[PDB]
Amino acid sequence: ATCDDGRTTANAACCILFPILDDIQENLFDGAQCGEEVHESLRLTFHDAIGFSPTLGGGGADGSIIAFDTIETNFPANAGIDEIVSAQKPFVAKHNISAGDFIQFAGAVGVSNCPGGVRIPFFLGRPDAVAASPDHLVPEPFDSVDSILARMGDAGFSPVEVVWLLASHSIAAAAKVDPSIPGTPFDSTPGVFDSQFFIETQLKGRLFPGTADNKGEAQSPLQGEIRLQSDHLLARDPQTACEWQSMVNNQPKIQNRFAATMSKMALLGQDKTKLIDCSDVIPTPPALVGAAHLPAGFSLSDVEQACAATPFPALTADP
Numbered sequence: 001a002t003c004d005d006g007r008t009t010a011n012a013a014c015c016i017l018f019p020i021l022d023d024i025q026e027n028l029f030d031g032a033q034c035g036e037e038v039h040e041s042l043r044l045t046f047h048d049a050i051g052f053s054p055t056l057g058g059g060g061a062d063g064s065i066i067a068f069d070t071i072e073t074n075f076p077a078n079a080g081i082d083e084i085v086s087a088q089k090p091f092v093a094k095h096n097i098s099a100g101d102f103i104q105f106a107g108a109v110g111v112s113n114c115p116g117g118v119r120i121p122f123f124l125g126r127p128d129a130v131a132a133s134p135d136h137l138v139p140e141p142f143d144s145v146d147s148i149l150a151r152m153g154d155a156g157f158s159p160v161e162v163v164w165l166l167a168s169h170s171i172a173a174a175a176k177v178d179p180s181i182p183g184t185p186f187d188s189t190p191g192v193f194d195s196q197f198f199i200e201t202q203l204k205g206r207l208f209p210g211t212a213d214n215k216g217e218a219q220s221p222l223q224g225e226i227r228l229q230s231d232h233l234l235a236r237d238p239q240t241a242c243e244w245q246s247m248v249n250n251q252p253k254i255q256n257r258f259a260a261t262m263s264k265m266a267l268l269g270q271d272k273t274k275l276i277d278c279s280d281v282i283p284t285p286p287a288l289v290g291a292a293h294l295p296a297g298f299s300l301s302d303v304e305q306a307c308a309a310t311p312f313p314a315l316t317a318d319p
């Protein structure tokens with residue numbers, strides 16, 4: 001199918017997305033950059049979608065965090081989310097797609113801006129949200145691995161899938177964990193969808209990059225990087241640590257698993273056969289610049305190995 005400006009897509013219904021794409025690349029993502037708003041928009045897909053529990057309710061990836069922002073953005077686990085929800089609201093008001101559709105679309109478009117990144121499958125047609133998420137559905141960085149895996153499993157995700165999803169922290173910062181240093185990234189290449197995150201979370205902690213007593217925070221190996229206590233445990237806990245380590249310098253696996261599991265999350269509370277596949281509207285991501293490596297001054301003796309069965313992979317380091 002050919003749309004009114006000459007761009008082509010497999011399903012004609014997908015044509016309405018092209019102007020939205022143009023609008024968000026320029027005005028949400030600063031000219032199709034992999035920056036702050038991509039990071040925030042990706043976080044948003046998860047905070048929207050994970051509001052889904054057979055026992056307590058929530059319609060999953062349904063736009064509820066926008067439609068019902070007054071309730072949802074005041075949940076403690078949604079700290080700092082109101083800023084991206086306010087940025088996105090006017091695009092949803094202006095255009096003719098549902099909030100739920102817009103959140104997943106914006107997420108997928110954003111990630112496609114990041115070198116190393118993937119084109120997350122995208123379906124159009126979600127209806128407007130009909131309920132707010134309950135509170136206590138979003139994992140918090142001071143939660144146990146047991147608690148996190150139980151929460152995620154309740155939403156339909158296995159332990160390994162939680163690891164695959166946390167590839168997102170390769171392009172992510174925190175603002176509210178340590179509010180004296182807002183925007184401090186979880187790995188050293190927040191602009192690059194790579195395995196640096198999995199390497200640096202495995203390094204021995206050295207310092208607190210800001211203040212020293214924040215809930216949900218662990219020592220970082222690097223100034224200007226922040227480590228969540230949750231990432232610290234997941235990297236090291238026997239349930240997840242071998243999966244964790246397997247992502248390292250395994251870019252094809254990161255890409256393949258993140259895209260698959262992101263498509264699964266984006267579809268939570270939704271029916272794929274009721275939606276139209278518009279995946280081909282998402283841009284082609286650039287290729288990885290870099291192989292992932294140890295930061296300068298580090299060696300392999302800096303790695304806390306936690307996988308019993310497999311020795312951490314050899315790695316290059318800067319001089």
Ligand code: HEM
Pocket residue numbers: 036038039040042043045046079080139140141142143148162165166168169171172173174175176177178216228230
């Ligand atoms: C598995 C349990 C998870 C925990 C405990 C967790 C925790 C956190 C925390 C505490 C922040 C920082 C918020 C702030 O203070 O500004 C954050 C940021 C972020 N989260 Fe995770 N998260 C988890 C899973 C996920 C998932 C599955 C995704 C997938 C989309 C996601 C994507 C992101 C992104 C992209 C950011 C960066 C936001 C920004 O730079 O503004 N998180 N996460």
Ligand SMILES: C[As](C)(=O)[O-]
Pocket residue numbers: 135136137138139140143147151
């Ligand atoms: C039960 As909870 C996801 O608020 O630790």
Ligand SMILES: C[As](C)(=O)[O-]
Pocket residue numbers: 136140142143
């Ligand atoms: C704030 As809680 C006890 O649900 O992790």
Ligand SMILES: [Ca+2]
Pocket residue numbers: 047048049050051058059060061062063064065133
């Ligand atoms: Ca939701």
Ligand SMILES: [Ca+2]
Pocket residue numbers: 169170171187188189190191192193194195196197
């Ligand atoms: Ca990165």
Ligand SMILES: [Fe+3]
Pocket residue numbers: 066067068069070
């Ligand atoms: Fe509102």
Ligand SMILES: [Fe+3]
Pocket residue numbers: 293295296318
């Ligand atoms: Fe380097």
Ligand SMILES: [Zn+2]
Pocket residue numbers: 028029030035036037
């Ligand atoms: Zn910006």
Ligand SMILES: [Zn+2]
Pocket residue numbers: 036037040083
């Ligand atoms: Zn921001």
Ligand SMILES: [Zn+2]
Pocket residue numbers: 019020094095096
């Ligand atoms: Zn429009």
Ligand SMILES: [Zn+2]
Pocket residue numbers: 135136137
């Ligand atoms: Zn809670």
Ligand SMILES: [Zn+2]
Pocket residue numbers: 139140142143
């Ligand atoms: Zn909790």
Ligand SMILES: [Zn+2]
Pocket residue numbers: 145146237238239
């Ligand atoms: Zn455990």
